[PDB]
Symmetry: D2
Subunit: 331 residues, 4 copies
Amino acid sequence: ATLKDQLIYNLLKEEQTPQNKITVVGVGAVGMACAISILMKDLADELALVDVIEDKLKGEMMDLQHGSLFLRTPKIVSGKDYNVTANSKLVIITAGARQQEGESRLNLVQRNVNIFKFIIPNVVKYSPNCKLLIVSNPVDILTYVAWKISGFPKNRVIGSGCNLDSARFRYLMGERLGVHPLSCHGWVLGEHGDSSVPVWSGMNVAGVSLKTLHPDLGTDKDKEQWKEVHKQVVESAYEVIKLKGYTSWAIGLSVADLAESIMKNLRRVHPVSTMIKGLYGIKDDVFLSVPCILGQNGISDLVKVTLTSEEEARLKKSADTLWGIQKELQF
Amino acid sequence: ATLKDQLIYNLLKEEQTPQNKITVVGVGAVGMACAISILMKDLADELALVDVIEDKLKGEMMDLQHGSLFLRTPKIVSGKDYNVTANSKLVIITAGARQQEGESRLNLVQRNVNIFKFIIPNVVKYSPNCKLLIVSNPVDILTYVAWKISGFPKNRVIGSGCNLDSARFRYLMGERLGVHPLSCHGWVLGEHGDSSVPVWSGMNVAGVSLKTLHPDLGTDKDKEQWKEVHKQVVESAYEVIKLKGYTSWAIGLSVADLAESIMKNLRRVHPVSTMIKGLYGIKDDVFLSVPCILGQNGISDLVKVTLTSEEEARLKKSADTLWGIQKELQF
Amino acid sequence: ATLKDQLIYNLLKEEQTPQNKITVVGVGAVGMACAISILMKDLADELALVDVIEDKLKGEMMDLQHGSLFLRTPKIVSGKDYNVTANSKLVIITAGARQQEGESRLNLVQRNVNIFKFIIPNVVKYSPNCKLLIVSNPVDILTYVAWKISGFPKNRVIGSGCNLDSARFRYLMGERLGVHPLSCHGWVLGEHGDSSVPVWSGMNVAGVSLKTLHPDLGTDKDKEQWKEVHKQVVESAYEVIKLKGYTSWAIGLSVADLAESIMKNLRRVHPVSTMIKGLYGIKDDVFLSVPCILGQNGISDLVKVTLTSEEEARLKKSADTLWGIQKELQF
Amino acid sequence: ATLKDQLIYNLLKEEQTPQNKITVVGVGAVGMACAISILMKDLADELALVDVIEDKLKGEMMDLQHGSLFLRTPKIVSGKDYNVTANSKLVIITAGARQQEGESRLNLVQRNVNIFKFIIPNVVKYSPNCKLLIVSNPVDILTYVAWKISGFPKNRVIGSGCNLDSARFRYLMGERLGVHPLSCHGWVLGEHGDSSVPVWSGMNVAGVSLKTLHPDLGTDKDKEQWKEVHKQVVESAYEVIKLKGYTSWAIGLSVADLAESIMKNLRRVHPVSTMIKGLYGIKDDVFLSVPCILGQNGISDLVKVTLTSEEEARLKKSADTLWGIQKELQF
Ligand SMILES: NC(=O)C1=CN([C@@H]2O[C@H](COP(=O)(O)OP(=O)(O)OC[C@H]3O[C@@H](n4cnc5c(N)ncnc54)[C@H](O)[C@@H]3O)[C@@H](O)[C@H]2O)C=CC1
Ligand SMILES: NC(=O)C1=CN([C@@H]2O[C@H](COP(=O)(O)OP(=O)(O)OC[C@H]3O[C@@H](n4cnc5c(N)ncnc54)[C@H](O)[C@@H]3O)[C@@H](O)[C@H]2O)C=CC1
Ligand SMILES: NC(=O)C1=CN([C@@H]2O[C@H](COP(=O)(O)OP(=O)(O)OC[C@H]3O[C@@H](n4cnc5c(N)ncnc54)[C@H](O)[C@@H]3O)[C@@H](O)[C@H]2O)C=CC1
Ligand SMILES: NC(=O)C1=CN([C@@H]2O[C@H](COP(=O)(O)OP(=O)(O)OC[C@H]3O[C@@H](n4cnc5c(N)ncnc54)[C@H](O)[C@@H]3O)[C@@H](O)[C@H]2O)C=CC1
Ligand SMILES: NS(=O)(=O)c1ccc(Cc2c(-c3cccc(-c4ccccc4)c3)nn(-c3nc(C(=O)O)cs3)c2CC2CC2)cc1
Ligand SMILES: NS(=O)(=O)c1ccc(Cc2c(-c3cccc(-c4ccccc4)c3)nn(-c3nc(C(=O)O)cs3)c2CC2CC2)cc1
Ligand SMILES: NS(=O)(=O)c1ccc(Cc2c(-c3cccc(-c4ccccc4)c3)nn(-c3nc(C(=O)O)cs3)c2CC2CC2)cc1
Ligand SMILES: NS(=O)(=O)c1ccc(Cc2c(-c3cccc(-c4ccccc4)c3)nn(-c3nc(C(=O)O)cs3)c2CC2CC2)cc1
């Protein structure tokens, strides 16, 4: 008899069957920040990692495993084969190609489409009932791509979208007011990053409309230049990329926040990218961030924000530019 | 009036003072993993980061700040000047040089000594009552270096030591037994890494001694080769380094574990590197890991583990080796 | 030698000092729910309990101590003597008399004033720098009582106020909308309980004003009867009291929420009872709930909510009523 | 269109299907302490409460619901009908009769059996795949009763047993040593309370056997009287009952600890009561606490503690007395 059998009497030859499993595909800085954030929030009973770089993948898995004593996620697995991902409730895509020096980031779209053409069918093959959370950029385009390839209904395909943009907005708003971002409310909608739309009518503390207090809010003649808050939502992201080479910690925390609502069926409202055709005169299949109710079935509902004519037109124009690029992608 | 003053009536304008502050020096992978782990465990109400690479430092700080919505640590600061670190309760040193190709371990440690000669006096100036937690390698030697440079009493100078090695031991033990590492008990003592000592007499589940169940435990005669568990404690560290280039997540969690005991005054027992002169025939100023009680004053007590003659001789040999290196360091 | 000295070598024998200490005075259902909530949220490194019923006090203390394995608050103490409370950062007052059958509300408050005349001077003696959080009812009147007895500056005397009423409001709002209360925003201000004021202009999801969507919101004309949401804020409290005899769990969580902002210096915004003289035509020393910024110094700022004429008149009428009662209290 | 439909566009008519549901039956002080502890540890996505006292049940449910803002458990339900319990992963039984003044607690056994004859078939009817965790006293007898009535395999019927007794043991051990109970290891096995067995051979800090350090450990001639540690495991429970009337907080934390391992599939080792026939010469169907591995299938394995002849005989005698009473219960 082995020492294990000397010490331990077994009652059950059990079905190792995962109940609250999450997969992260792509273990770059973003994927691993999502992983550590999910692990430290105790959201999964099993975590699977997938990548194409085999040594890096195994090393990251082992590094996490060596911390198991300090975690409450008892099973961490990895592999290039998607059988390690079977029966995931939630599959997070952070995979992408490396932009080469000098080239334009427009070259990355089709490269990442080709990556998704390999990833997404394998995800579906092993977790046909999962929710897909897309993080890879350009995220609104790639969420549409993931939706198309997966065949999933739109409630189960979620783009991380403007959840991070809105977190940055509330951070910068809190800095100006001396109030924790949790008590500073404001919504950035539409496309992630450059073209996002700040909804000035919704910016408030304790239910007090800042736009009503300060009618110049969000205009160019605002002597306090609150529009700079949204400008810095975009430019601070480019600044972090310039300063440290990439961003990782805030998106990792953002993604774990989305995973928390999904895994725990919270029905909190998050600005994530969803298939928005049938709103705002948008007549094309495109994904844009609006406030969505997130839970165990993905996006079950969304909030219809009342928009100014200018805000609505910006969303329509974003839909047009998304549709224009999408019709030139090769599936 | 400003929008802020329209919205908010100020009662107090008093110089806010830091209450439960941690500093991390060095924002490579290890420092940032310590940072994110401390942040996600809510161990500090203020986090300061220091490095000599100014752009990387600012970018990491901003990245964390952008996740403020998702955290409960309201102040995150950074700078190359140590005034940002003033009044830390705990200062975590992860700074070090990059060992160059063909650079000897002896030349490398001296370069880290020269780094500590700049860091530690500056830390002491602005937080003279802090606890020092030394992570940089060689960690046991550099804990001695920090102790000698700081002038601190020995209770307030702690090497992360074998807390990580023991976590790896318990992970590997749990893998063999099918039990969570939290319930698998076993202690790795002495030097971090290469020369660490597994204390087979303490390995147990539910208080059942594995050595008494299986007297070959820890010997080469053991048909089940349980010595491989300790061999993998050392080799798996080198394997992660080979596979992903460095280690970060497990040491980050290990450091947060130590920080939790110190910041919350828990008086849990951890194997950390402490001044061991007076034990095991060691008469030199050497730091090695033994089980220590950790709380608000650093190391207040240590456990006197009953060691075999062979185990004691390995600690004494380690102390001899460490002192031989330390007495040739240029301070 | 003793077993303890065989096992443990002591380095430091120094008077341990309290670092992040909370006291709860009064260990009825409300005090103990505050206690367990603070313990399970890891808000304090020392918890002191005080009451005049000595056996009940010791039994509650011991019961918590027996769960120490499952907590991270290493010191739990109690006594009728206030030396056990020395150096608390936050002192939570839940003490009060049992209203007798046929005893008037005016006779009852005077009995709680006489209780506060013994409690508050003793608290101040041993923690002169603490923040006072008053929970006992009538909470707004007794916050004034504690302020006048303590001599504390107004920033350090806080009534739990309408944080609980607003939580009930958001729960009931979330039930109607199918959204988690965390994402349902609405503020109940003024007096706790009976005479509280719902601020319909601030009720929103994702920054979308419900009053602007549904102009009948808050009126008797409203076919959807949203005023019933605020009516249930008051009536559901009385219903719980009728059904289980008292309320405890929600106020315990509400108090822990306030304690979290104070202990961690979060500067989140909470509707708590604060000195309101100078607003809304109120010239008397009266405490009512408005949104306040809570941190390490108590209430540092308050938000000036834009109120309708009717809302402002209700706050002014409340202040008139409270002052009429307070000026007849015997100190 | 209602305000809800004006604000929110619905994507999914969804199956409200519970994924991580827990039920507590009996909402006395113990049941509600288990409930609040489970809620504050975020273990369930749905909590159901059952009792026969209808007003108390509704009041406790409402009090919890009013705290929803401060929790992450989005659905709290209650009822006397067990359809509210459908599809629970884990069902915790804390129901029991009130001992009348003067009568012997032996009269309670059959009264609580009769209670279980109503409860357990209804639990099975609506959650035929759940794990049953029995807390009601006498817990080892009633765990056997629940096992018999339910028809479940023994891995899915768990008595809270000596998990609490062992937590008290480690608390008292920590008090003597000045070490947090988390670092003080020691096991109390067998029957809950009066007849429990302290396993002195397993008592250790950092793997250091206290019995080997101090061979009088656990004997009557021990000049330091460490046997008093186990005496106080029993007597401190009776003391709390005398002082406050009952115990609740420590058992609530104990039960949440067991629920954590079960719901998160941790495979930690806990001393819980399990059907032990086939060990220690025990030839009868009886439940006694031994160290069990707990996870998503309940008790999957148990540790075979090496026992002295006296320890083994105490467990055999306990089995005999359990069997003697059980054969006089009426099912
Ligand atoms: N939506 C948002 O708010 C944010 C999104 N991101 C995006 O996250 C993505 C990843 O960011 P980083 O980690 O910094 O990039 P990275 O390039 O370092 O990591 C990408 C990983 O994907 C792996 N990969 C490539 N092809 C793969 C394939 N078929 N299958 C599996 N794995 C594959 C790669 O080997 C790599 O390890 C980027 O697209 C980035 O723009 C980053 C921050 C904010
Ligand atoms: N004790 C343990 O268990 C473990 C310790 N380590 C050690 O952690 C240390 C850091 O590891 P990595 O982050 O991977 O290396 P890294 O080289 O990427 O980071 C070191 C950082 O220290 C900075 N630095 C150099 N001189 C400085 C000075 N005067 N002041 C402030 N910052 C300075 C550097 O700019 C660098 O950003 C290494 O020595 C490593 O061996 C790594 C894992 C396990
Ligand atoms: N502000 C809010 O939102 C809410 C406040 N409360 C109030 O909390 C207070 C306590 O509620 P319960 O625990 O249910 O009542 P309780 O009567 O059971 O507990 C009050 C405790 O105060 C003790 N006491 C009396 N005089 C004392 C003195 N000098 N010093 C120390 N302790 C003393 C009493 O022995 C008692 O144990 C009540 O006034 C209640 O109305 C209750 C829930 C909501
Ligand atoms: N195993 C352990 O370590 C510990 C176990 N306990 C035991 O917990 C049990 C409950 O303790 P308390 O809450 O203080 O007692 P309690 O008598 O106040 O609560 C029992 C509840 O069960 C309800 N009840 C009675 N019959 C019922 C039925 N058919 N169906 C549903 N509910 C029913 C009762 O109405 C009552 O609300 C007791 O047996 C106690 O000995 C208490 C502490 C330690
Ligand atoms: N609506 S969309 O058309 O899908 C969409 C449009 C635009 C972006 C910008 C972008 C990209 C990115 C990378 C590679 C290719 C393209 C690309 C290619 C073709 C056409 C359009 C865009 C975009 N990366 N990126 C990052 N953001 C972070 C962060 O930390 O926020 C870190 S990199 C950001 C947000 C910027 C930092 C604030 C993204 C998406
Ligand atoms: N007792 S000592 O003399 O202080 C002491 C002795 C030996 C070590 C080894 C070591 C080093 C290291 C790097 C550079 C120089 C020296 C050095 C310089 C002079 C003299 C001796 C050694 C040591 N780095 N390193 C790491 N470990 C990890 C991990 O993840 O564990 C990641 S890098 C480890 C632990 C090994 C991987 C498991 C460490 C300390
Ligand atoms: N603005 S004020 O003048 O301070 C102020 C005015 C009125 C109240 C009502 C009240 C009392 C209470 C008890 C005893 C005496 C007095 C009293 C004495 C003198 C003068 C006026 C009132 C008030 N108790 N009480 C509770 N609420 C809960 C809960 O769970 O909410 C549980 S008991 C509530 C809130 C009600 C249930 C919703 C409270 C405060
Ligand atoms: N092995 S057994 O035969 O099942 C078994 C045997 C003995 C007990 C004792 C007991 C009871 C209890 C209540 C009612 C009836 C019987 C009873 C009836 C017939 C025959 C035997 C016992 C026992 N209640 N009780 C509590 N403990 C706590 C705590 O906080 O620990 C709070 S009440 C305790 C533990 C004591 C405080 C430390 C329990 C079980």
